[PDB]
Design an enzyme around this catalytic site. Structure first.
Site, short mmCIF file in Angstrom:
data_model
loop_
_atom_site.label_atom_id
_atom_site.label_comp_id
_atom_site.label_asym_id
_atom_site.label_seq_id
_atom_site.Cartn_x
_atom_site.Cartn_y
_atom_site.Cartn_z
N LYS A 283 2.66 -6.72 9.72
CA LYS A 283 2.15 -6.03 8.81
C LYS A 283 2.16 -5.10 8.39
CE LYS A 283 -1.23 -7.91 5.66
NZ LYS A 283 -0.19 -8.67 4.75
N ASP B 239 1.30 -6.98 -0.85
CA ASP B 239 0.26 -7.22 -0.92
C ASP B 239 -0.76 -6.37 -1.86
OD1 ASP B 239 -2.64 -6.80 1.69
OD2 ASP B 239 -0.63 -8.50 2.66
#
Lengths: 467, 467, 467, 467
Positions: free
Chosen positions: B145, B185
């Site tokens: 991430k 995202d």
């Protein structure tokens, strides 16, 4: 409203409430930093420490306000996992770091620390101050730091090796001769750096100065061990010389028994200074008539060559005396050389030193004096020599090690020492003038070291643009 | 005492106390983990959460305790400063991240998030879960991430470009086609991925699939916007089948307006499922009879496309009705699709849907249901579909994009969907099988997911060796 | 005097003496080759062997004499030291290799072998043949072989890991997805490939198909264990067809217990072929009526999987019978599958099978038949299937794995088999066509193989230029 | 017919019509070059200039005929697009270059030029002469040049920066410490190089001497600014010394007000030479009694430190006098120092200088004297000092900057200056002997600079083979 580059907001020095603007801004700078890293105690404390120390400069060049806030943020911080097999076959795991803090003045330079208590905050803490220390040496070095919560104590050589090969198995991809040159520190001595270099050369297939602190047989420098201890005495001699205080009429008290305390005393003896002590985390030793070159030879090539307890010193001197669980600070001196641990000298100790005649304190170790102790020293007109400057010789030889690796040369011990003396004189000169110029004190070396070390890194950062 | 490898310590599945050791050692694994990262609140939660959900798997295989403890630590976690000029010409700063968590099943995979809220704890929490989630897809995707505490809201398109190029000037050295494939995202949309891909290509001089979520004209893939929502329905439609419950005979209350919801509905309707609601931060609309293709169409192609508000829907559906700041969870149903925010569904709500025949919760967002609601649901036999599974379609197409860029190809919308429907069916099979085998529940999908996501990872890790 | 290229010297296919020059110059090519490597016994044998088998091809094209002489020399041959700590902590050493032989048809392909017997001569012999063998597959695979004189027998799993990581710390710089894709072999099994792939990925930080033979969870391919045995039968099943000989009407005596044999049988039985035997270092079992799926099953999933001995089979087949230290070659048959060791079949044995209706030998191992037996067989018209062909399925799937990793895909067990059956059919066509065209034998597969394997290579080389 | 290498055709020097062969060949050399680049006026003119200047050498070593024709062709010329955002958000575009001309003597060395009129031809023109200038310094430096039609005038600092980061965003991939070390030039001063270096270090992650002209705080050299101006006077002192002409009895006239004219005058004053002028593109200034160190301090640290107009000089000297729209050439002198622009001195100006007593001309700027002006100078027995040689000191310090970066050192101002004096003496010595040896003139420095600078690069090119 903005500096010449336009990238930075000024704090109008001709406003009516200027000082308040600066103070309140310095405060907002600290509030935002704190919020970025709420629980990094060691880091926040070192930042706050330098930040306010620099206030004289901010009043002067408010443009440096946005800058220090940014430089307090590592250009790159890499945290990595490292697995290795213990001597039982059981797979192990350790958290590792390598904060490549600043690169304005040169390749990241900072040691590695293998210690159970290592963590981001502490690594960031040593890295932030490493910047300004490197800047002060005058050489071309940036600032970095790293390490592992890997505990060397209790490990076989074979384990220190496997962990050293595993560590570099990841670290290598981030370092290089002209990128980031790690060095040693607590946990990483010659042995570790030998295995770290070995693995590196093995993977990358290159023989260079990517690591300093190496053995003189494959890239190391002479004085690699005496550097810090010598730089320290040279820095204090330089301070003593400028005040016209006869160095051969001083009495010194030293703590610690490492390579810093050991060679500080050795240089002290050469300069004809009377040394009365050395110490171990268990207790300190005392030589009534002062220490001798011979005595120092016992302590040195034995209780560091064999790694004993400074207590064994008594098996060599019938005239010595050990003091269990005590520090040397109660012994009257003119010069104090804390070369042991962090917070070595506390308030009561600074009081004894103070009431005993101490006139200067030379920080051999990293922030040995407690915060209240520094205040007591400065408030009592006692010369305080900042770790960043006084023990910078250890970092200087480091740069000289790289210089010798780049030139594919190997200077004599005398050539390296001469450079160490001129570097230490350049550091004192930079700390005096900036101190005088910004606090009118001149011997407020703590402000001077911070200002000089910061001004060079900042002007450069601006000159190099947005990054 | 040890596994086949002799690298980990086995608890002894045949000792009297055993079941206690699996409870203590687990407690021990969360101890050290916690002491390592004392204040990563979100992180410690996702870990502890997975930790305990996996007890069924440890019971059989205790070798997996030492492992999860090791995998909880990112293989590499890069934090970096980024400075960019804003529109006023002022130089700005932002903290950035890229946690490369695990690379057992493939290169690191994970989106980037630019939210003022972003930090290491959040990135690690989102990153850790990415692993297993990407594990259940069946594709070769490791976990990771990234992101920055940078906030697009308020920024010009030019500012988002300057920041993206600045971001990539550092991140390019850590990512790559077969190393790390970041994605979009919250904060990083098709635009930001386009601007990042632009800098990446400019610096590295290579056209490839380093990022997923690209426009279809240069690497993008069909079904990019529908993959998540689609798979959510495809997963449930698969859960119902195994139960012999006719999908075209249920009612579904759904929250959202993002791609997950907007197409969850589009597939629900296509299977003849009646969807009565759609939500938004301000409120949720309602269709007594149900949304029409044209209804859902106005919504999608207009509120999100024109970025308006779900209220405005009342400028098309004179039949509908708005319900000022309220959660749809009231309206009774059989299939509820939480696809709005974390903890979207609380407890009381879990009580409403509970007493109204809600037989299956199918998470469409990031952890939508509270620790309570999950228990409530699971306590009343309501099918609970684990985020890691139901919305894995987003990652599913992420790797299909990689596959397509890798093959220098571009599949039809039809092909991609068939491969998508297929993956989700396997995701169902793994979770189910595993659930049954380890918890005898067969529909305890929350456990099936973890036990299946973690296994492919843990075995692989062991097979790959000490790294 | 020279070819179209004017780089090689043509013999003159229309000079009176000609046929003598093709015999002398060939003798000359083996001269220099021999004087170059005076003591590489195994190497000179595989070369001389291929050299003379290719005379049919030189006859037409003499330009290929200068070429084979040049291709006999590895494009690159890396030998390296590797030091690893053993379990007792003692530092160990081993010689290692990686002969990158030819890269005309693709990247270098070839397994690694860890046997106390390994050396340059052996590696070169195995490596040289790899070329042509990988040429007949039709895929884009160059030739290469690697390994170490390291012996796993006696080593702990930890030791095999330490050695593999040490191996790869050197070998990673010489291999890669599109450079060299090593594989498994004797000593390097799925474990060792997993431990090597682990180090390779850790150092290079790239997930890809640098090695074939990986576990299916991270790059592996279905039919990895059966590809060789399968293709062996698929090749014969193909040979029989062209002869109009009903595969389901023959009897087969087969030697082995490795994957080649264990699945050669599994396919033989699936086509209704009756297999009466299976071998092992200590002996060979026998089934009067034939092995049963369940019979073959106990064997496979138990003796190799539990690594027992073929004797133990008598704890399932009360019908079977063991024949203490003996070669199955006695039992009469129609199809004999030598898949145990080099020179598995001698001469006398070639006489037994000869007088018993053995109509087709189908090599399943590395050169199973003696220089005699091949002649015996070939002298009595017994179909001789060249190792390079019959067991090429192992390499066949090797490149299918590459294809799959390259496409970031994973095919079904069904797909792989169809592509496998297909390759082997082409392998049959090339060998056949060529045989007929150059030796008028059409079933002199030993020549078909060489002439076809070498041609695609030699032409390509010429087309690629002077390198 | 051919030299020792066989790669080059001789022009038989013992033929009956040799000179005609040479002339006609030199002509064919020019005709082919012209045809390769028909419209590069600046380039063709500089080539033709050197080409025929070298004729004495060609008559001698005809082998150098094919060579100069080849060296006139850049080993590599890269032209690239560069986009950047202006302070209004509007995306902009500029054409950039970087001609990596010659690499025989060392890494490509040549500055960068940001000027509206930059183009291939002009960049190629500065690059071709840069070769021979670098060769003359005696150091190890090749020849390069580059720039952009980017106009710095009228740009914010923020724009010069964005363009500087954009430029390097492409350029970096072609340069490096040991590959190509660009420097500054018109448009690129310290500020630009600061942002160019900053971007470079940011992308490549390395701190090295890839760019010269850097700030003394991060890699720069002392004398970086005085170099050219000093080298110039040193070169002329060297010429004066060899003729035995008392330097302290000379009178100098200087044009320009840049760093070249400024320090030329400063060194002139130190050597006790009377300087009467300096100038601006608007007019020139005159000091009746000669200039003073103090006067030079006004002009320097003000009308270059503030960037005024040399007219302001009057606010400092009540004895000075400005001359609008005029050059200094009408002022009687013995020494003339054109340090302004190209074609500064024309025919009529060379006549005034000539009839006024001028005995030597020192080219401070790039080809300041018109073509007719040089002829007038040489025809009237007036020593003409070639830009390539006289103002080479500016390039010398450049090489010394790299040397200091490689050695990781920082020499004193006095050490650098001493080297600059010996380098300038080596240049005069090479230009005298080659001039004497090839034209029997000895003070035909224009021929000497070209011959010496070319002979070293050519012998080397031959020694290094075909490329």
């Amino acid at each position: 409203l903005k500096d010449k580059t336009g990238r930075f907001v000024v704090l109008d020095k001709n406003a009516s409430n200027y000082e308040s603007l600066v103070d309140q801004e310095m405060n907002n700078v600290y509030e935002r930093v704190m919020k970025l890293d709420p629980n990094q105690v060691e880091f926040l404390q070192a930042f706050h420490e330098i930040l306010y120390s620099l206030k004289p400069l901010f009043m002067e060049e408010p443009k440096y306000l946005p800058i220090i806030e940014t430089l307090s943020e590592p250009e790159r911080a890499i945290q990595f996992r490292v697995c290795w097999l213990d001597d039982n076959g059981v797979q192990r795991k350790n958290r590792c770091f390598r904060v490549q803090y600043n690169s304005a003045l040169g390749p990241y330079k900072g040691g590695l620390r293998f210690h159970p208590s290592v963590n981001l905050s502490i690594v960031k803490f040593l890295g932030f101050e490493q910047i300004f220390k490197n800047s002060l040496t005058g050489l071309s070095m940036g600032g970095g730091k790293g390490g592992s919560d890997f505990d060397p104590k209790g490990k076989s050589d074979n384990e220190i090796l496997k962990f050293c090969q595993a560590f570099m198995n990841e670290l290598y991809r981030h370092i290089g001769p002209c990128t980031d040159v790690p060095a040693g520190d607590i946990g990483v001595g010659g042995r570790e750096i030998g295995y770290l270099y070995g693995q590196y050369k093995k993977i990358v297939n290159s023989f260079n100065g990517t690591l300093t602190g190496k053995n003189v047989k494959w890239g190391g420098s002479n004085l690699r061990v005496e550097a810090t201890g010598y730089g320290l005495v040279y820095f204090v001699l330089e301070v003593l010389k400028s005040l016209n205080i006869p160095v051969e009429k001083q009495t010194a008290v030293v703590s610690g028994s490492g390579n810093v305390a050991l060679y500080c005393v050795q240089k002290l003896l050469h300069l004809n200074v009377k040394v009365l002590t050395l110490s171990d985390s268990n207790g300190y030793v005392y030589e009534p008539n002062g220490f001798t070159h011979e005595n120092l030879e016992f302590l040195i090539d034995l209780k560091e060559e064999k790694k004993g307890r400074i207590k064994e010193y008594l098996n060599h001197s019938s005239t010595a005396k050990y003091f269990p669980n005590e520090k040397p600070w109660g012994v009257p001196c003119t010069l104090a050389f804390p070369c042991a641990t962090q917070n070595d000298v506390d308030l009561d100790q600074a009081k004894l030193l103070q009431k005993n005649g101490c006139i200067l304190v030379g920080e051999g170790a990293n922030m040995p004096s407690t915060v209240d102790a520094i205040n007591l020293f400065k408030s009592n007109n006692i010369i305080y020599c900042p770790s960043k400057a006084a023990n910078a010789g250890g970092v200087a030889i480091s740069g000289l090690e790289m210089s010798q690796n780049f030139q594919f040369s190997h200077w004599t011990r005398e050539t390296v020492d001469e450079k160490l003396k001129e570097i230490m004189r350049n550091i004192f000169i930079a700390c005096s003038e900036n101190a005088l110029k910004y606090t009118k004190n001149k011997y407020d070396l703590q402000a001077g070291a911070n200002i000089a070390g910061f001004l060079k890194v900042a002007e450069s950062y601006i000159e190099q643009g947005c990054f």
